[model samples]
Target chain A: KTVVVTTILESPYVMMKKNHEMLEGNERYEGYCVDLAAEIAKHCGFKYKLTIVGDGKYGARDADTKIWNGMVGELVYGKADIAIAPLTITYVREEVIDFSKPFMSLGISIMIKKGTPIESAEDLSKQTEIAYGTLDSGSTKEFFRRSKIAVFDKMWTYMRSAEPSVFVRTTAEGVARVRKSKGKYAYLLESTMNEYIEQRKPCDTMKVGGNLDSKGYGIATPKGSSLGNAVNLAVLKLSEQGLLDKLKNKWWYDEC
Target chain B: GANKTVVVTTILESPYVMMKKNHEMLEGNERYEGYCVDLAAEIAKHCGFKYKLTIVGDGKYGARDADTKIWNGMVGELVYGKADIAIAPLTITYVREEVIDFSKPFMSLGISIMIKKGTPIESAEDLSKQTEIAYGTLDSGSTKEFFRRSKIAVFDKMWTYMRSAEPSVFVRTTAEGVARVRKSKGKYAYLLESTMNEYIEQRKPCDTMKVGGNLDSKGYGIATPKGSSLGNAVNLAVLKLSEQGLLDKLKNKWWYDKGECGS
Candidate 1:
């Protein structure tokens, strides 16, 4: 009678253990999002299952295809009761489902080679020696593209009309582009992940620039889920009690 | 131009703000004293806008109906154009931020639990678990709403009893809550922030002590309407004044600056 909470293998949010025997949920299970799921379970008085999103992409809408992927697809198709991940709340996704109040807030930033000339978010929006792109059909791209504000209105123009490839499919893939292209390419990603990547070993990547727009990570449920109220309030109470601070530090800052 | 006067709306809190014993005899800054007077002066100086200090005809922080989303309080004043800005110590919450812009936190405090000395209750968890000791917050204020909306384990459990318990647990304001605790012997405890708790602890019949850990961290910020042309300038002025030590100086100027080290 436990709720089957669906999650993904995205890093920071969700990732599988390298040494298979120690962790639960077999080959596919591990990560920050998984731990958060357990913590939310402890507080909200429920048991849940953590499963990977069936599709690989984060979530997307194709005008021609009219299909979605990953955690978004799971929630859309009723494959799970909830999604507890770093899924950005977006206009398109909101049209089909409900989102809890944000558990985490972030803006997209550009990650670049340590010595790259990019200095601020403003620089990325201009013609520079380096090239920049975002994870396709995701928040970072949308933030730049959808803004009516000054800095963002300019940034969207730059992102939409890059000379070569202006889009990547995932944050990992974007980071890989920055790594392989040396100082030539920068990846735009959530500040949380950008900060996370900056700390790891062999990290030549550094998130440069202020956030372009503000968005939050919400627990998503199918449209009109009864549990939304209970779940949303839980996030609020945790925030009030500083549990979110405890979790963020434990997962991101404590070990390192 | 100085006489044109913008409407200034504020909550009526004691020492910080209240009607002068002689309101008919005084008007403008002459009628107001303490922190509120100084705050109004500084805001006028920074914003290049002159305003007349006016007590909110009705006191409320302008909250949205979660179902209907209409606003109330000084918040309503600014949103509806009855007032141009709100310099009140209203906490900058996520929901409010959607309708108004806030400056960086000028002051920080937390929702505190106050109880009589030697009371067995020591924390939010302790208070929530014990049925014998009843607790409540100022009616319709942020703390009450916070508890009402909380979803954490202990707070959520406490909500069931709080929402339906008695002869209406809500008190009109912070002072009413403190007075009830002082008179209740051991039957009641009050939930309020550290600012009011610290103030009352210094007053006569000092029996209450802040127990357990604080329930949350919060800070007050200056607010302007969403998409207002003056939002950025107003926000920057608050930060600048805060950095200049003007805010700290003003805190003591009108709010019991008798102590030397409040900030």
Candidate 2:
């Protein structure tokens, strides 16, 4: 049986190439996860189909309906065999799915339009003239909601009660809001995504301040799936060979 | 199988594992006290088992032999079935991960620079370009391997110099490396894990300081032998403890609450 891979399209991770209509199957997509999935499949001795999640979200559980959505839902419902994307490894996600050791390390960081005065999280926290928020229904929001740290708590307190609702639905929307708002809006996202956007064209935005916390992105699969162990070991093998670093540079920095 | 007293392989790394001041008069686990000592107790309690602490015979953290294909140190203990687990500040690395299973990181650390407080060095680039202050890492540790395997320009050059430095730049332990930095005045810099560097910076005399950001970041995990049944439960315990803030609490108790230096 061919492994069914589910991933989301985040620039430089998985995306449609120019003239995508002319291409079919995996040829339509190319980026970090595109290459990573290939490497993992090659090592595990399998063929696979690369499919995008219908919801276009990473994955999150609904509070009321108790249904899972995004790439996580696909695996949970048996619609996909695995999730190979920039999926954050969190405690909640691990309960339902297994994640290989982090393929990349990142932390929550701030993104601002160029020339913003902010230099740190404190800078964003103490001011009100400039509005700030994070991607909705993701770990960044969960972090702020669950944080006890004084500054993060304050930022969360503001975001939750702010007028006009600063939260965006996805990373691209967050990036767009920052660029269009000039100096009025700041987006809090994982450093990996922020770094990618900063290097893209227009260069009108910049990632400011150091990452606020530390964690990693893991390759995910349904719990107890047989592929889990093999792919986990394969990730370690590739990492030792420095192929992960090479792939990261190829997509994120090297391409720019 | 009857419930067995698990054998935990650890090391003499300061602040992670160390002999208590009255060790001569103490007994068993009581004779040793530090971060890892306390951590083992909590882990044992959560995992519902009893364990005896033993120091790894070779005193090396863990590394594979270039030839003969034998492993050495705490890692070797697990690989050879000499211990049930390793509970010291053992770093999680790719090669080691293949041979053993590590729980989620109990503590995060990075390769960092430690220099005499008044030294002119401010970054790794500074250390790479200058031979005035000789720099080195603890032998048989991931930090040394990091440089040896590094393809990055500055680090690769630094490794070239260290492998050839006269008087031997590498040290046998973290303490020896720190001792070199303090004794060599401003002429030596110790490259070690940031956790130790931060702990040492808080000790008495405090003649040294950590300079610049950490070179690379990773975590130290509670390690078990490959396919050991305890790996899953232990991994869950670490994650739970992290979320409940117990890990941070333990870190403060060991690293800073009794620190000699002022806040």
Candidate 3:
């Protein structure tokens, strides 16, 4: 059976090529995850079709309704066979889906447009001059909302009620906001994304200080999906063969 | 009457430890101005101890010489009981870890590439695949030691290239390596700690940039000779400073706030 794969449209992870409009099939897309999916398929002996989540999100549970959205919903509702993207492995998400070994390790990081006075999350939470927040919907946002750690909880309170709304709908939008906000805005997101964007053209942003916490991204499959075992083993073997490091360098620097 | 001056041995690395521009007029610890000098002062104050700063005789961080089987640099001073503690940009490595006890890493860094702003070099792979530009590291520092000991395929290949290159690619000091990168234009690359690379990038002339991610993860630590009485107090002091944001503040003060280069 062909695997119906669901992914997200995140830069350096998965994105439509410049000439995607003229192409068909997977040829229309290219990135770190695209290359990773190809490698997994080759080793697992399966045919797969890569599809983007319709909601355009990483994932989150609606607090009031408790209904899942984004790629997590697609897998939970059986809309896709597996997810291969920068999907973080968290305690809340693990209750529903089975995640393969982490393909990449990342953490929450503070992204500031160049020349911002803020240097750390502590610096941001202690000041009111520059407002900051995470993506409106993602594990990063949930991390703040659910956190009990003093610094994180303080930031959560500030971001949850900050005037004019600190959250953005997409990583790109948040980044754009940071660039245009002059020195008055900062964005909290995964360190991987922050570091990736910092190296892209316009190079006006930077990931400052250390990551706030440690976490990783894993290839996820529906609970009890038979592909789980094979995919996990494939990830391990690929990681052992150094393919992951090579691919990271390929997408992050080689492409430039 | 018995509270002796804690002989803190260190190295004279720029921005970490350096002789002040007006050293002729100052005395004792006042003669130095850098991150380590300031850090030493703070650590001593918090730990409630009196100390004196002494530069390493050989100007090395610390490494065991194979032929003579003797340790040199600050590590040597500590091992032989010439100093009570070390407060410098001395890296905690496997060999040194076995001989000297390091406090919690006060600063985190990794080996990074230094390139002139417009060079075609992007990563170590780029340097290894071509020959037009030569690359090397400080001869006896941790960066050189990493290349000498690495067994990973890519690093091994790069090590092979570095070892066999004619006219010797290694330099005596980090300053020498950086100066070569600047003078050689796009023809030479230097590998050093990310902390130093970032520090120099903000210095005057602003002609060099730290390109690519660091090759490995490591940190600089305050070390006390194995079983020294000062280890516990110093480790706690480092953690306290780090928690209080003093370490980050010191980095900004020396590395960026005092920066001469305009962004």
Q: Going through the candidates in order, state the TM-score of chain A alone for each one.
A: 0.88, 0.96, 0.97
Global local distance difference test of model 2: 0.89
Best by lDDT: 2
For model 1 the interface RMSD, in Å, equals 12.1
Model 1 agreement with the true structure over B103-178: per-residue lDDT tens digits:
5455566788888777888888888778787888775467777777776778788777777879666677777888
Clashing pairs in 1: A13-A33, B34-B254, B35-B254, B62-B72, B122-B212
Residue B166 in candidate 2 has what lDDT? Answer: 95
Q: A1-256, model 1: which lDDT tens digit per residue?
A: 6887877667777776677667665245656677667767777788787777676556766659787767787888888899998988665677677776667777677799889988886776676677888887665665566566566678677778877876987778888889888798888889999888888767788988676544567888998797776676666556666677677776676312
C-alpha lDDT of residue B40 in model 3: 96
lDDT tens digits, residues A1-256, model 3? Answer: 8898899899999999998999988888999999999999999999999999999988888879988899998999999999999998776787688777567877799999899998799999899989898896688888888777688889999999988999999999999999999978999999999989988878899998898865668899998899976787687567545578789888888312
Kindly report the interface RMSD of candidate 2, rounded to 1 decimal: 3.2
For candidate 3 chain B, the 10 contiguous residues with the lowest summed lDDT are: B236-245
How well does candidate 1 match the true structure in TM-score terms? 0.55
Q: Put down candidate 3 lDDT per residue, B142-251, tens digits, no spaces.
A: 78878887767777788899898887888888899889999997999988899999999998789999999878765677999888878767776775675455787898
Q: Model 2: runs farther than 4 Å from truth?
A: A112-132, A144-166, A179-186, A198-212, A246-256, B1-5, B22-24, B66-68, B117-134, B148-166, B209-217, B244-263
User: What does each candidate score in C-alpha RMSD?
Assistant: 12.2, 3.8, 11.3
Q: What fraction of the reference structure's interface contacts does model 1 contain?
A: 0.07
